[PDB]
Design a protein around this ligand. Structure first.
Ligand SMILES: Nc1nc2c(c(=O)[nH]1)[n+](Cc1ccc(F)cc1)cn2[C@@H]1O[C@H](COP(=O)(O)O)[C@@H](O)[C@H]1O
Lengths: 181, 14
């Protein structure tokens, strides 16, 4: 307790995507590193660029170790994501705030029993408008998905006026909302 | 099951 690091429920892996049109989507997706304590998380977060500062076309992904941040993964292919669409004014006011809140929801296991349904989260930095999402394992788990959505929206501080949607990765890889909150 | 408050996690950042 005087000397022991604070362990997390899960080990997490941070990934970085930079578009290179000469490579497959997968090959542009690279591991930064992994951590399984609070201290190790802050050691990583504190040395890397804020999302608002990345080049357009870059992503961060934070996924539970053993889950690859792509829809092909066993634990992603039946799932989907809660999506936050930002405009260009929100890159300034909201992007980095929202992303850090998202990471804290993951590492802290903020969704009670349904934190097990969380796979990971991704921030897309794009000229057109940034996106943040939380991916869950099974689009058919209505209680899990719906509980995660509610608590996420609460944690982000989004007003009742703003409505966010959840889309199955099947639909996206083929977009309609299975749920909104 | 290991859960952490936002407040605790923020306190650790430095
Ligand atoms: N094989 C494969 N390809 C992916 C993947 C992926 O997980 N697997 N993703 C990530 C992804 C995963 C789930 C989503 F709902 C949306 C995007 C993007 N891509 C590629 O980038 C394009 C742009 O996606 P993005 O919104 O991530 O910039 C997609 O249409 C697809 O060609």
């Amino acid at each position: 307790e005087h000397y022991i690091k604070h362990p997390l429920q899960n080990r997490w892996a941070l990934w970085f995507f930079k578009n290179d049109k000469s490579k497959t989507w997968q090959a542009n997706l690279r591991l930064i590193s992994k951590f399984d304590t609070v201290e190790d998380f802050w050691a990583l977060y504190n040395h890397i660029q804020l999302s608002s500062n990345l080049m357009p076309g870059c992503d961060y992904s934070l996924f539970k170790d053993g889950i690859e941040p792509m829809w092909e993964d066993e634990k992603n292919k039946r799932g989907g994501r809660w999506l936050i669409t930002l405009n260009k004014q929100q890159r300034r006011s909201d992007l980095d705030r929202f992303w850090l809140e998202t990471l804290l929801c993951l590492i802290g296991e903020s969704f009670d029993d349904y934190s097990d349904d969380v796979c990971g989260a991704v921030v897309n930095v794009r000229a057109k408008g940034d996106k943040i999402a939380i991916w869950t394992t099974e689009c058919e788990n209505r209680e899990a998905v719906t509980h995660i959505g509610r608590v996420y929206k609460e944690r982000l501080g989004l007003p009742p006026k703003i409505v966010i949607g959840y889309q199955s990765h099947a639909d996206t890889a083929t977009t309609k909302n299975r749920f909104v909150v | 099951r290991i859960i952490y408050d936002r407040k605790f996690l923020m306190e650790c950042r430095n």
